[PDB]
From Swiss-Prot, chain C:
This is V-type proton ATPase subunit B. GO terms for molecular function: ATP binding; proton-transporting ATPase activity, rotational mechanism. GO terms for cellular component: cytoplasm; cytoplasmic stress granule; fungal-type vacuole membrane; Golgi membrane; membrane raft; proton-transporting V-type ATPase complex; vacuolar proton-transporting V-type ATPase complex; vacuolar proton-transporting V-type ATPase, V1 domain. NCBIfam families: PRK04196.1, V-ATPase_V1_B. Present with 131000 molecules/cell in log phase SD medium. It comes from Saccharomyces cerevisiae (strain ATCC 204508 / S288c). It is found in: Vacuole membrane. GO terms for biological process: ATP metabolic process; endosomal lumen acidification; Golgi lumen acidification; intracellular calcium ion homeostasis; pexophagy; proteasome storage granule assembly; proton transmembrane transport; transmembrane transport. ATP binds at residue 362. It comes from the Eukaryota. Belongs to the ATPase alpha/beta chains family.
Length: 59, 594, 468
């Protein structure tokens, strides 16, 4: 049981490496995709902002 | 007219600028053009029923009146179809939508115009006087219901100025030029009729020709006759649907209609897709029984007014068919749910009930709704003879005297089948309390039995009397247990036990326990009668019951297995077996008695 | 797919909102406005107290320039001069996504666990639209639980409404937790549980059970305690059902739902039914909550198009150990099956303290028998029910008459009963019983009797397993 308790402390450095593996790639790809559609969406939003929408409620 | 929406309150709306309308009249409302019927009017503010959902509606929206009350479409294509409470094609709506939802404002027609039919002119020559209720031609709709009759809707008279030829046709086509005053009489293959008002008839008649269920207690004990009705409690362990299935597959009904109001959805989907699995057990094996079935299934989740109008729609369809001189049956999901909807609507309207949550008129409304059933001779030259039978599946609130609807039903009906809770507690289904149920028709129906089993009535009566005596003596014995008791005491106890385990028990699913004919029941009854009578007359002079039963041995068991006689096996092989059984029983009694 | 790409275009037109400042009256959970243009019934509106605080509510009644608006986040500090009302002009929209796993949601459905917005894939109406009646499939693949009573007498097929009629001060929540963690489908699963009108300890308990279970990653919660404004309690179940529908019928995943309290729901509905006059039903309850209950229970089952299925398990608390009381009675009307507990057995230190006699599963026949189980099950259950009732009534009779009319079979049924409650019903909080050994114990108990009393057993089955 003492050996098992000690081994319960053996899993303290694998957690950080697993977290780094889980994060790094997704971080990198998010940063990358932050540029392809970047300008496209910028233009889309800016253009859509200025549109007039003249309307009257009729009832 | 073009109204403006003034106020909206959930399933209630107040329009303005309403003038000259009928407090029962369809209306198209809102931009989405929803459906609603005015209810209460005053000045120019209209209280309108809404049969759909309200969301995002605003004042001033256009309001379109119609000028007519709620009606249903009558003609071909009805049969073997499923609709909502307000007559909308579930299948057509689903397929058109290609989704799993119901859009708001859809108007899929009740009867499709996408199918042609092979019409045939009747015998009415052009230039002849005509009136409502007179057949002028027929069309083929289905094998089981071939030759769909075509009738002139009532309130329609004139002289036939023309007749359409035979051949293949669809709806929408004028087929009969008539003139009351002018050519205006143009009629296509279908027509309509307001739900609230029942159609007329030549006259009514008596009742006879008892209905059959296949389950021994009902037919044998508390007779049921077509052109009538009754209340059947639903326990979900007493064969909630088995009775309905047996009725559908055995009742000599020309048409079957079942409706769903408190459908939990599971039962709905099941019954729907297990009807396909069902087969017509009549005049050969026709895989589809739905050719005799048309359903109006509505879950609670639909607007309450739909559950309100479901029964009116169904009964109207029933009358439409029976006008052709046929036999029809109705099945109701749960009347209690309908009453709950009624009280909900009344309260929402803002008028106090008087029955711990039910408006007073409930009784009158139920009486009127019931009174459309019966037997009658049709109206018109062809002289048909229809018959409408129904049954109300009363769903109690966990009590019997708590819900007045029970009293209302018991005050109007003439056959009523109660329920013993303890039977269910013992899983003794079929669970029916004998001491409470009753059927008045037994009186008249002697004139029918005397033609087939002229000794059945008195035998049944004596059997029921014996059962009552056993019930009575139970209350004495239980408080004191076994004591100084005559052999007749054990005789009554054991005969009652055998009757109940035989009669009041039977598997809902077996070739010999889920269905029985009249003659087989007759044989069972006579065998038990002979058993008990011979036993009693034997003990009348000594013959201690212990040694008596030992001498007769397993005669009680000998008759017990008779239930395993499979019916439909000739009716003479089974009858011959029962004759042999009676012979052995009578001789065994005569001999072992001495 | 592309059609999905071709439908979001509507999310690019923006229209400002009217900001009214004409509050006309306040009465507890209700606010009354004046001079309103185009009320647009069933609208979500936002309010700003004269301090910077912002809360929101929904309109319920509308007429000429008069709209009646309920509100959730309390009603204190409201002034009739310095408050501003804005009209979003729309009903409630709930953001939805796949990422909500392992997220804690308030009663209003917001990340209360330091996590940012859900980054929604879409906003959904909390009130969906009805499923076409001709679109549903019947439940099958009877799922097990490891609980002798539930698994045997009232087995459940996934896709059914199943209330748990609990009584006050009972370990019902623990029963549900053991059920979920030990959930077993042998003929994985996403669990969303909503906490509304509840105390605190239950929350930490359930979180602990999920963490130890390890399934916390495949579940999400909506939390709403008593200190939270009571009014929003009428919303949480809508959010839960919307999320469940989205996940199941768009990802084809089998999902189970747990509702802690319907009693608080009925309480909130009654609460906001009197600030405005309403002709009350039985015990003050507006008669129409039948409709709302149906709306809640509308969402369940399976359909042909979607493989994923939904199953509802609402825990209900009897106010006074009662069924005819409006809440339990109405629930029984429309719900499916029922699970019952009794105080006597618990006082007798019996876990779980189920009461078989009232508890009945309306739907068991379809998902039992051969193909997935052994056909004996039906007769086993019927005979068990019958003998249990017989023993109970025999004990009751003796309690008033003594040993003066007690047949041998009477005391036989008694001793059978005592052993039945002692062994069969009792189970450890960590042992799961498959149907097999369950039926084995059933036969063990049964074999005390002769082959003639057990008339609820077919001669065939009566002879197959009477002795092995």
């Amino acid at each position: 049981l003492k050996e098992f308790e000690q081994k319960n402390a053996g899993g303290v450095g694998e957690l950080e490496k697993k977290a780094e593996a889980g994060v790094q790639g997704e971080l990198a790809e998010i940063k990358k995709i932050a540029e392809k559609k970047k300008d496209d969406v910028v233009k889309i939003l800016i253009e859509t902002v200025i549109k007039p929408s003249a309307e009257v409620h009729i009832n | 007219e073009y109204g403006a929406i003034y106020s909206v309150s959930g399933p209630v709306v107040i329009a303005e600028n309403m003038i000259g309308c009928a407090m029962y009249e369809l209306v198209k409302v809102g931009h989405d053009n929803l459906v609603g019927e005015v209810i209460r009017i005053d000045g120019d503010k209209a209280t309108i029923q809404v049969y759909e959902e309200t969301a995002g509606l605003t004042v001033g929206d256009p309001v379109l009146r119609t000028g007519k009350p709620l009606s249903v479409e009558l003609g071909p294509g009805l049969m073997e179809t499923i609709y909502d409470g307000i007559q909308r094609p579930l299948k057509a709506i689903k397929e058109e939508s290609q989704s799993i939802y119901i859009p708001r404002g859809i108007d899929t027609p009740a009867l499709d115009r996408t199918i042609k039919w092979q019409f045939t002119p009747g015998k009415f020559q052009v230039g002849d006087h005509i009136s409502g209720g007179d057949i002028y031609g027929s069309v083929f709709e289905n094998s089981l219901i071939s030759s769909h009759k075509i009738l002139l809707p009532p309130r329609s008279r004139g002289t036939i100025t023309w007749i359409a030829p035979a051949g293949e046709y669809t709806l929408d086509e004028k087929i009969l030029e008539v003139e009351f005053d002018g050519k205006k009489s143009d009629f296509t293959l279908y027509h309509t009729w307001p739900v609230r008002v029942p159609r007329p008839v030549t006259e009514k008649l008596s009742a006879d020709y008892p209905l059959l269920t296949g389950q021994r207690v009902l037919d044998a004990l508390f007779p049921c006759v077509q052109g009538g009705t009754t209340c059947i409690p639903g326990a979900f362990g007493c064969g909630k649907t088995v009775i309905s299935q047996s009725l559908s597959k055995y009742s000599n009904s020309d048409a079957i209609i079942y409706v769903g109001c408190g459908e939990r959805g599971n039962e709905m989907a099941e019954v729907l897709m297990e009807f396909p699995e069902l087969y017509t057990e009549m005049s050969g094996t026709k895989e589809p029984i739905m050719k005799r079935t048309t359903l109006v299934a509505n879950t609670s989740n639909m607007p309450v007014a739909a559950r309100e109008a479901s029964i009116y729609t169904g009964i109207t369809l029933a009358e439409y068919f029976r006008d052709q001189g046929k036999n029809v049956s109705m099945i109701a999901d749960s009347s209690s749910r309908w009453a709950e909807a009624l009280r909900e609507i009344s309260g929402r309207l803002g008028e106090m009930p008087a029955d711990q949550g039910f408006p007073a008129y409930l009784g009158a409304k139920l009486a009127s709704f019931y009174e459309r059933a019966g037997k009658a001779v049709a109206l018109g030259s062809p002289d048909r003879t229809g018959s409408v039978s129904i049954v109300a599946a009363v769903s109690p609130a966990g009590g019997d005297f708590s819900d007045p609807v029970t009293t209302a039903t018991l005050g109007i009906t003439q056959v009523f089948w109660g329920l013993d809770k303890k039977l269910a507690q013992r899983k003794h289904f079929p669970s029916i309390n004998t001491s409470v149920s009753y059927s008045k028709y037994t009186n008249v129906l002697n004139k029918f039995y005397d033609s087939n089993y002229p000794e059945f009535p008195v035998l049944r009566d004596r059997m029921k009397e014996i059962l009552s005596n056993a019930e009575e003596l139970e209350q004495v014995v239980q408080l004191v247990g076994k004591s100084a008791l005559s052999d007749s005491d054990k005789i009554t106890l054991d005969v009652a036990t055998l009757i109940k385990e035989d009669f009041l028990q039977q598997n809902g699913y077996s070739t010999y326990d889920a269905f029985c004919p009249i003659w087989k029941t007759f044989d069972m009854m006579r065998a038990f009668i002979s058993y008990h009578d011979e036993a009693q007359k034997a003990v009348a002079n000594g013959a201690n019951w212990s040694k008596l039963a030992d001498s007769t041995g397993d005669v009680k068991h000998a008759v017990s297995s008779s239930k395993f006689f499979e019916p439909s096996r000739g009716e003479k092989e089974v009858h011959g077996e029962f004759e042999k059984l009676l012979s052995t029983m009578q001789e065994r009694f005569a001999e072992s008695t001495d | 797919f592309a059609i999905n790409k071709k439908a979001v275009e509507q999310g690019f037109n923006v229209k400002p909102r009217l900001n009214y400042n004409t509050v006309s009256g306040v009465n507890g959970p209700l606010v009354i406005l004046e001079k309103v243009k185009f009320p647009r019934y069933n609208e979500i509106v936002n309010l700003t107290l004269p301090d910077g605080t912002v809360r929101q509510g929904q309109v319920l009644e509308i007429r000429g320039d008069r709209a009646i608006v309920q509100v959730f986040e309390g009603t204190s500090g409201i002034d009739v001069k310095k408050t501003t009302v804005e009209f979003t002009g729309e009903s409630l929209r709930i953001p939805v996504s796949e990422d909500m796993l392992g997220r804690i949601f308030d009663g209003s459905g917001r990340p209360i666990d330091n996590g940012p917005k859900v980054f929604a894939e879409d906003y959904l109406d909390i009130n969906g639209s009805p499923i076409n009646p001709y679109a549903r499939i019947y439940p099958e693949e009877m799922i097990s639980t490891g609980v002798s009573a539930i698994d045997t007498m009232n087995s459940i097929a996934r896709g059914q409404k199943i209330p748990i009629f609990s009584a006050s001060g009972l370990p019902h929540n623990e029963i549900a937790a053991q059920i979920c963690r030990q959930a077993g489908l042998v003929r994985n699963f996403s669990i969303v549980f909503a906490a509304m009108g509840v105390n605190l300890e239950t929350a930490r308990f359930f979180k602990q059970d999920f963490e130890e279970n390890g399934s916390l990653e495949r579940t999400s919660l909506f939390l709403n305690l008593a200190n939270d404004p009571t009014i929003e309690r009428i919303i949480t179940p809508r959010l839960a059902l919307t999320t469940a529908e989205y996940l199941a019928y768009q990802t084809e995943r089998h999902v189970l739902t747990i509702l802690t309290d319907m009693s608080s729901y009925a309480d909130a509905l009654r609460e906001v039914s009197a600030a405005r006059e309403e002709v009350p039903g039985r015990r003050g309850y507006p008669g129409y909550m039948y409709t709302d209950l149906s709306t809640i229970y509308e969402r369940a089952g399976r359909v042909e198009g979607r493989n994923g299925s939904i199953t509802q398990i609402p825990i209900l608390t009897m106010p006074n150990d009662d069924i005819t009381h409006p809440i339990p009675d109405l629930t029984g009307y429309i719900t499916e099956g029922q699970i019952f507990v009794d105080r006597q057995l618990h006082n007798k230190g019996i876990y779980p303290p189920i009461n078989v006699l009232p508890s009945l599963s309306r739907l068991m026949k379809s998902a039992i028998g051969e193909g997935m189980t052994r056909k004996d099950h039906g007769d086993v259950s019927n005979q068990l029910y019958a003998k249990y009732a017989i023993g109970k009534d025999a004990a009751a009779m003796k309690a008033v008459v003594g040993e003066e009319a007690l047949s041998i079979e009477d005391k036989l049924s008694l001793e059978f009963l005592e052993k039945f409650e002692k062994t069969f019903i009792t189970q450890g909080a960590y042992e799961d019983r498959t149907v097999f050994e369950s039926l084995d114990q059933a036969w063990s108990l049964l074999r005390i009797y002769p082959k003639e009393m057990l008339n609820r057993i077919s001669p065939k089955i009566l002879d197959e397993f009477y002795d092995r």
